[PDB]
Design a binder for this molecule. Structure first.
Ligand SMILES: *SC[C@H](NC(=O)CC[C@H](N)C(=O)O)C(=O)NCC(=O)O
Length: 241
């Protein structure tokens, strides 16, 4: 996250860190039930040197605050039994950039570990709404990755504006969230984490999955996120949640 601040400890108890063994923190995820996380499909694509698609390569940390303190009280360590990437995921366009991760053992709910709420398929996150992005990604483009979880407040951008800012790149699964002026944005290593939206009684719903951007925090280049409501039924079908 560029332009953000240190989160308070336990502030985002649905934010999860995914480490690939020997590679450190690679992406974020969100806790949605005792057994399931939502993340970004593009995080789990093999390259010639590492099989990111193999669930056995991964560790999820729940209740994590500081990457240098992974054994701190209340942090829960879990393996993955399965990665379900969206069948329509495209590694060139990043369309359908969403995956479901099955924990090998259930999370224990606590003050530090709590699921985010899922929005119904009919819910619209309106243009202009303030939303929060969180993660341990870079704090400057080409920069480096934060030890302490970062938070930044960003706003939903109108889809037509989004399409025009990033021509031939924005599908209806995608949403721009940020500022046309730049300044606050997700960045490398934030991929897969949740957008957190404060809803009508203060409960927090997931409004998206961190996906991609052109640089970070640049003018006219807000971050791109996978939308959540359109995947509500897909989530239910595949997880029971
Ligand atoms: S909608 C998901 C979260 N709800 C809960 O954690 C309460 C029910 C639990 N499933 C349980 O302990 O049984 C939630 O409200 N998260 C968002 C928030 O703002 O806290």
């Amino acid at each position: 996250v560029v332009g953000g601040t240190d989160a308070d400890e336990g502030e985002w108890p649905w934010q999860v860190s995914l480490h690939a063994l020997g590679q450190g923190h690679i992406c974020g995820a969100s806790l949605i039930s005792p057994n399931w996380l939502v993340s970004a499909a593009h995080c789990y694509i093999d390259d010639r040197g590492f099989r990111y698609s193999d669930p056995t390569q991964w560790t999820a940390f729940l209740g994590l605050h500081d990457q240098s303190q992974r054994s701190a009280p209340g942090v829960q360590e879990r393996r993955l039994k399965r990665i379900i990437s969206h069948p329509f995921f495209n590694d060139f366009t990043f369309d359908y950039d969403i995956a479901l991760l099955e924990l090998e053992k259930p999370a224990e709910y606590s003050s530090m570990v709590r699921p985010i709420c899922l929005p119904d398929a009919s819910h619209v996150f309106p243009a202009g709404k303030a939303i929060w992005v969180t993660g341990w990604g870079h704090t400057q483009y080409g920069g480096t990755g934060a030890l302490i979880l970062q938070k930044g407040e960003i706003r939903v951008i109108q889809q037509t504006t989004c399409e025009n800012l990033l021509p031939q790149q924005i599908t209806p699964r995608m949403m721009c969230v940020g500022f046309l002026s730049g300044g606050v944005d997700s960045c490398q290593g934030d991929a897969g984490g949740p957008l957190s939206s404060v809803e009508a009684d203060g409960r927090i719903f997931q409004a998206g999955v961190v996906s991609w951007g052109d640089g970070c925090a640049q003018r006219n280049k807000p971050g791109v996120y996978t939308r959540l409501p359109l995947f509500r039924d897909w989530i239910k079908e595949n997880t029971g949640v």
